Design an enzyme around this catalytic site. Sequence first.
Site, PDB file in Angstrom:
ATOM      1  CE  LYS A  46      33.653  37.335  46.176  1.00  0.00           C
ATOM      2  NZ  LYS A  46      34.715  37.870  47.072  1.00  0.00           N
ATOM      3  CE  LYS A  75      32.254  33.700  42.329  1.00  0.00           C
ATOM      4  NZ  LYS A  75      33.187  32.545  42.413  1.00  0.00           N
ATOM      5  CE  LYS A 120      41.146  37.242  40.406  1.00  0.00           C
ATOM      6  NZ  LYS A 120      39.902  36.475  40.265  1.00  0.00           N
ATOM      7  CG  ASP A 121      36.463  40.713  34.989  1.00  0.00           C
ATOM      8  OD1 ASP A 121      35.935  41.702  35.525  1.00  0.00           O
ATOM      9  OD2 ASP A 121      36.675  40.633  33.762  1.00  0.00           O
ATOM     10  CD  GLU A 151      36.669  31.981  40.569  1.00  0.00           C
ATOM     11  OE1 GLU A 151      36.940  33.170  40.837  1.00  0.00           O
ATOM     12  OE2 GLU A 151      36.418  31.129  41.448  1.00  0.00           O
ATOM     13  CG  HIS A 192      41.309  32.336  39.109  1.00  0.00           C
ATOM     14  ND1 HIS A 192      40.701  31.103  39.214  1.00  0.00           N
ATOM     15  CD2 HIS A 192      40.983  33.011  40.237  1.00  0.00           C
ATOM     16  CE1 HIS A 192      40.040  31.035  40.357  1.00  0.00           C
ATOM     17  NE2 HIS A 192      40.196  32.180  40.995  1.00  0.00           N
ATOM     18  NE  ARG A 193      45.357  28.309  43.830  1.00  0.00           N
ATOM     19  CZ  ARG A 193      46.020  27.797  44.864  1.00  0.00           C
ATOM     20  NH1 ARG A 193      47.101  27.062  44.659  1.00  0.00           N
ATOM     21  NH2 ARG A 193      45.589  27.999  46.102  1.00  0.00           N
ATOM     22  CG  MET A 210      40.427  22.576  37.092  1.00  0.00           C
ATOM     23  SD  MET A 210      39.812  21.838  35.530  1.00  0.00           S
ATOM     24  CE  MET A 210      38.711  20.598  36.170  1.00  0.00           C
ATOM     25  CG  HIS A 211      43.845  24.836  42.528  1.00  0.00           C
ATOM     26  ND1 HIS A 211      44.487  24.506  43.703  1.00  0.00           N
ATOM     27  CD2 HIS A 211      42.931  25.781  42.851  1.00  0.00           C
ATOM     28  CE1 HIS A 211      43.985  25.223  44.692  1.00  0.00           C
ATOM     29  NE2 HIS A 211      43.039  26.004  44.202  1.00  0.00           N
TER      30      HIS A 211
HETATM   31 MG   LIG Z   1      36.988  34.373  42.416  1.00  0.00          MG
END
Ligand SMILES: [Mg+2]
EC number: 4.1.1.39
Lengths: 120, 434, 430, 434, 159
Positions: E16, E18, E42-43, E45, E135-136, E138-139
């Site tokens: 962060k 983002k 991690k990047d 999403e 990564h999910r 829009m779920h």
């Molecule tokens: Mg995220």
Amino acid sequence: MQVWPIEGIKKFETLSYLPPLTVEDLLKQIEYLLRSKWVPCLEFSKVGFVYRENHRSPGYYDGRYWTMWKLPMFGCTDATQVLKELEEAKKAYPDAFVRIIGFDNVRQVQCISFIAYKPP
Amino acid sequence: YKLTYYTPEYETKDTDILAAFRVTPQPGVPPEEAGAAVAAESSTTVWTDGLTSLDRYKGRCYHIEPVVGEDNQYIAYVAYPLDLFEEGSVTNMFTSIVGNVFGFKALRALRLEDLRIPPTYSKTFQGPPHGIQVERDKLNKYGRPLLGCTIKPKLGLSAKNYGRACYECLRGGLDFTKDDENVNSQPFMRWRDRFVFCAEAIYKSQAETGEIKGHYLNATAGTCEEMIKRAVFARELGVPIVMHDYLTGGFTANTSLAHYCRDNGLLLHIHRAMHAVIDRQKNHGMHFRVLAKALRMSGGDHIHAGTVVEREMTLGFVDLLRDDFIEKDRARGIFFTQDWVSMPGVIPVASGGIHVWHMPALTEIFGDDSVLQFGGGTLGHPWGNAPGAAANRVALEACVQARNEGRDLAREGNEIIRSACKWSPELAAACEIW
Amino acid sequence: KLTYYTPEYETKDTDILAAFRVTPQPGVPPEEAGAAVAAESSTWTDGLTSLDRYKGRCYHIEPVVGEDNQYIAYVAYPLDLFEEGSVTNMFTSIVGNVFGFKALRALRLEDLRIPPTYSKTFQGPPHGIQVERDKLNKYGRPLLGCTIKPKLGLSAKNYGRACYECLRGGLDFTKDDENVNSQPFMRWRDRFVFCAEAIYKSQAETGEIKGHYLNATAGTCEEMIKRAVFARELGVPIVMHDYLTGGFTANTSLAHYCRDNGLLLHIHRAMHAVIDRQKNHGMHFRVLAKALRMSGGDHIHAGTEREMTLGFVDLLRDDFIEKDRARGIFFTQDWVSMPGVIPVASGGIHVWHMPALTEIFGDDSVLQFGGGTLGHPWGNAPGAAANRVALEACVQARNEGRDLAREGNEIIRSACKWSPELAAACEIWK
Amino acid sequence: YKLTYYTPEYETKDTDILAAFRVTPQPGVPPEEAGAAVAAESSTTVWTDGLTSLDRYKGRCYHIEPVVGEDNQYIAYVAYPLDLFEEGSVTNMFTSIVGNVFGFKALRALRLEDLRIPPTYSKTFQGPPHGIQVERDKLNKYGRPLLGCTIKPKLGLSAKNYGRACYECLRGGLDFTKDDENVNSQPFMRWRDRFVFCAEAIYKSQAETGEIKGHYLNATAGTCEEMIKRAVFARELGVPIVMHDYLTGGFTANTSLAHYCRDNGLLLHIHRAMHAVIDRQKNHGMHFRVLAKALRMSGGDHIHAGTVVEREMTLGFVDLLRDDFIEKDRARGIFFTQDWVSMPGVIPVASGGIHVWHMPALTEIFGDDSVLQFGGGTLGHPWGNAPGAAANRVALEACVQARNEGRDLAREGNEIIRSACKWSPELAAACEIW
Amino acid sequence: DKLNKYGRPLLGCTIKPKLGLSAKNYGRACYECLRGGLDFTKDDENVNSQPFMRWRDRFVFCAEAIYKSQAETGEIKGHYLNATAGTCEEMIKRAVFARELGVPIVMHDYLTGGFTANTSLAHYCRDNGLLLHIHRAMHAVIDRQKNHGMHFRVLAKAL
Ligand SMILES: [Mg+2]
Ligand SMILES: NC(=O)C1=CN([C@@H]2O[C@H](COP(=O)(O)OP(=O)(O)OC[C@H]3O[C@@H](n4cnc5c(N)ncnc54)[C@H](OP(=O)(O)O)[C@@H]3O)[C@@H](O)[C@H]2O)C=CC1
Ligand SMILES: NC(=O)C1=CN([C@@H]2O[C@H](COP(=O)(O)OP(=O)(O)OC[C@H]3O[C@@H](n4cnc5c(N)ncnc54)[C@H](OP(=O)(O)O)[C@@H]3O)[C@@H](O)[C@H]2O)C=CC1
Ligand SMILES: NC(=O)C1=CN([C@@H]2O[C@H](COP(=O)(O)OP(=O)(O)OC[C@H]3O[C@@H](n4cnc5c(N)ncnc54)[C@H](OP(=O)(O)O)[C@@H]3O)[C@@H](O)[C@H]2O)C=CC1
Ligand SMILES: [Mg+2]
Ligand SMILES: [Mg+2]
Ligand SMILES: [Mg+2]
């Protein structure tokens, strides 16, 4: 005619070609950052130069990143405060190189980096 | 018709590509007529015209005014619709705007001064493979102009002797060394051999100094296949930067190279050979700022911008090359407010008869985001290339330190340099010859 | 002068020679200006080689008759300075830096002597005049073409429709405007498809081989070749490129592709006037013309003063062209069998210009009629017929020994007697 | 017709390819007639002749003179127009000039002695992948002839035992070791295995001595696909030099290999196997100098040039192989002044029964720009390969030192060697057996 | 087994802010987090390739960070480099460079990128030894409401 040395004068980018800075000259550079509204931060390392160990592709080098000393000094208005951290770093890691860097939230980027201490 | 193409009450659309032409009408040609002609001849009776709406494809002169330049001279503003241009093609932009109108008989002379590149069009170009910020981060260099030296003599040196000069210059304090624009591949020095020896030089100087080094390896070639072949080997060698003469090589080829550099992490140094053929005369041609905007769009990380020893005009296109938003300022050659909507900036390169004594002024005028390219300014040092590079690196840092402390480089320049000569024998020796 | 002014230097058969029209700044002697032009366009490390071996040198200086403070400086460049097969490097080496020299108010490159030793390192035209004529089976007359108008705004299909009507009426070619590459209103692949249908429809109808210069000019070399590749798949005979805006590196690659795939290459000179218009500064078109013949092209626009045009036309078409100042030929040029390029005449021409056009350019040329075809009151086919009839009427007259220069109008008027198409055309274009 | 093809007043064009033929006419054939026949039969009645101008495509004998060689022998000079030859194709040059005329009945015998390659034709050939200068710079070797040894026995050794010999020779002081011309790929030693072990040997000897080493890995093959496959693996191994038998492999294949070597930085050693089939007899065939010029054009960095223990003839083609401009000198077999317009030179390789005692003469005759290839001269040393290589390296340097001081190698040769034996036990042992 | 980690949940941190950070400053955060004890960084999403940070530059600096932290701690480190792209050609191009860099893991937003593209990426990762972090994004558009849509477990089995 003098021959430029091949050893003992490794460099650390900007300002490393000037003689060792005095406490006063050092303060001035720090003030420059503060007046420019940039955030000062200290970084240190026991390895002072770039190398290539993990890859040799264009633009990839190891040794560019050093370790952050605490955190960027946001809201700093007193240059001597940076000097204080510099002294603490030197005490905790006398055998390590310490450089002062600066960040701009406007340009959103690192824009400064100069050596502040080198071990004996 | 004057008023089919001369529309003084037309309001430009945010998607139009605008052009500012310095027009010199032939005797007997009214300014309104000249302006209309410029627009009509650089854009749009046959029955086929009835199968569409010519009005939506015509360029139009929405303003013309006598210019202060000289004898019967005017600045004509022309607006071109977005749909006329092929996305991502500087080649088509040039073809569409300056491909035909310069030979019109009713015009004694014509020069394109500026272009307003709308976001809707600029967004269709990759732009710089990396740009100012990325480059500084990749090379880990901050707080000062970059330094480089062009190897001399131009031609005649063997590939190895060429690399020798590279190493000595680099080990002395310069960030880069560079292939002359004319150095591609020739009988006295084939390109692959030069790349091999310059690579050895780059890595030897880097290991010795501990600072990241580079050498603009010229990939300019007779064909696109050769140009890429050279970029590919540089990629294999793992070096950080290559070079291209975008005007002599051309925009179609430059854009391809810019794409290759982006896909492979290579910085791209751009030389402007032959620009003076086009941008020298005030009455006819295209001002460099147009060629500069074109390069930023086609793609380049560095671009030669000339010397500082007119100033305002240079500063004008320097901002057009580095900044995100440049406000209209005709005093500096900026005829249109230009918004690049975050396209990376290009580092301007200053070269041409510059030496240590010019460091204060150069640092002052260009600021940190520039490359100061020397020639004899470093190679002409009485003690050799390494001491010459050291003198230039010391001189530059002395200027930076003084500027950072709040000193006036424009007024205290000489004292700053003289003061640095006290602890730098190399600089002292340089200040004695120049 | 200097190390650079050598008035008795005997040029070598391998030297590339340049003729510069130099305008010195006040107080700069012609000798110094010439030496400067040579020095600035060529040349402790100098001790590792021989500066004389790589220096450009001004071996002759002369004033320009009727001009104030204007001279022609001749400079000789050694062969070793240039990369073989690279027009890009030749331009970089000779005109890359010298035009900005402060000691010069203005500078223009008038001509270049390309030695056989250097030209033999270039492929040159993919085919050339003779091969093109044999490929298209066309002989004894200038070729005829028409640029589709309006330039932009038409749909790919409507564009092809115009192609077909023009070709079926008697034109050998139709063409994409230089600005027509690929755009929102008409994407290139769609245009190629419809233009292909038009080419083959008109050919089957008339029995004569037809073509449409499909523009492959693009933003990148990858796109340029992709367009040439589909043209290849379509089996059409000719493609086109704007060599100056696209660039020499790209043009040369395209020329090679065309040679490897049997495609004719029509070259448009867009933006040339930015460089060759003014007499005091820039590069004369004949230089840009030689550069194209070297880089590669089968056709090249040459415009529509008279003696100067005939001069570079010979430089573009012939094998050996002797020096001729009256025609702007500063150097005797020997192309050692490199094929010639067909010059293309275009710009405000119509049926009444056929006699002069035929007489000035001769058979080996292309006469391109834009509005001169699409402007015909009866449409493209009748418009094409009028131009074809007008041209053949001129050819017939010339072949019989008539003087096109003095009997031109009379030749056209006679043709109007049996050609309703030409008659209608003549009534509108006076 | 004698005077369609015999044109004694013809002035050669700077673009003509000239040929000097040693012609032996059959009894009853006048020299003018023989010369005309040679030109006509190596160049140009049918109606089609009327569709062009045969005069511009005919070769012509512009001079013929009785030669001092022997019985009814003459040297005929023929000029061929530039347009007859395909650019960059030595194959077509040979086909056009020597493809048919040697079987003409009116000639008892015919031999091509020389060829004048005009700049307009030579410039269409890449030439040596690197050339003398580049090679010296790449390997960092200056001031002395290079040294090498061919591994023996020719065939029969395992790939590993072969590499063992390579390492021992190289570690002793030789710059190169080499695959016999017959060594390509066979049941007793497949090529890839040999490349692997020779690579280990190259790098072991280099690390031990600190000097750059190499081994001419033979890429000569039955097909071009195999030839390239071998060059590709050498490229993967990163070794500096490969080898090809250009005459047995052929010019079409050699040119392709030369191009690959240029594109990949590989030096190319050229062996002349089968040359004696063509260049042995003075009355018929082609003199080696023609085969040598052909190789320089097709491409090669080294080329075998024979032994020195006729001298003038050897020195003649040596200059034709290394120099940029060679003046006409029939006393040394040079029938035409030859200008290479900067095409790189090829290093001549001397081999064949040479040993330490021949070092003075070899250094004297060839100079520094040569390769002295030994066989038993090194492998036959009583103490083994390493001592043998050392003896040869010492002997050579002793000669160089003495020559540099101004001593006469041709007269003081034996003393120079004897003197060096004083401090070199290895050389002493070698001078006792030979 | 590949990462030589047993007996505990793995640990990671998403960098962060983002968007807005330069590729280098992004890598700096990666290194500091990793050197402190986390197994992965991690990047976000949304981080694919944008004006403020092009993907290749991010991969370069994150690779430097991964290896610096690993050498310092002696434990295997990784950073989920997001390969999610507008086209399958771009998605693979990013996976290929990660492969060249020799890093252990890449990332994909399977729902926004799609199953056809995800399956292709999964095959590439198998053929090249790359771990794939999913990564999910829009779920919730689909699985939030109890009355309509598809429950996440279905989207999970699908993945
Ligand atoms: Mg995220
Ligand atoms: N119906 C009507 O309203 C009428 C229409 N027209 C006619 O329509 C036709 C249009 O086609 P045509 O002119 O033949 O050819 P094009 O418009 O297709 O132009 C072909 C070439 O002419 C040159 N050219 C034309 N305009 C200019 C300009 N503004 N400045 C410099 N050079 C110029 C350029 O040559 P290069 O690339 O060599 O520099 C260009 O490549 C003509 O016959 C014209 O007379 C005009 C009057 C009446
Ligand atoms: N020892 C000696 O004999 C001396 C040597 N010299 C010195 O040698 C050095 C040479 O290097 P330097 O001049 O810095 O740079 P370069 O010669 O490398 O030239 C760099 C740029 O300068 C511009 N330029 C130079 N010559 C001209 C010209 N003839 N016309 C137009 N523009 C020109 C061009 O700018 P662009 O591409 O932007 O158009 C060119 O790209 C200098 O320091 C010079 O003072 C001079 C006097 C004495
Ligand atoms: N221990 C012993 O029993 C002895 C061994 N030998 C020695 O062994 C060594 C063998 O190596 P060396 O002779 O140097 O070289 P090589 O046998 O490696 O031959 C190299 C070149 O010599 C030429 N050559 C050799 N043999 C012939 C031949 N039969 N006909 C034509 N040309 C020939 C060829 O030259 P090209 O390709 O130019 O035509 C060949 O390429 C020598 O020193 C020799 O004196 C001899 C006596 C004693
Ligand atoms: Mg230069
Ligand atoms: Mg047009
Ligand atoms: Mg042998």
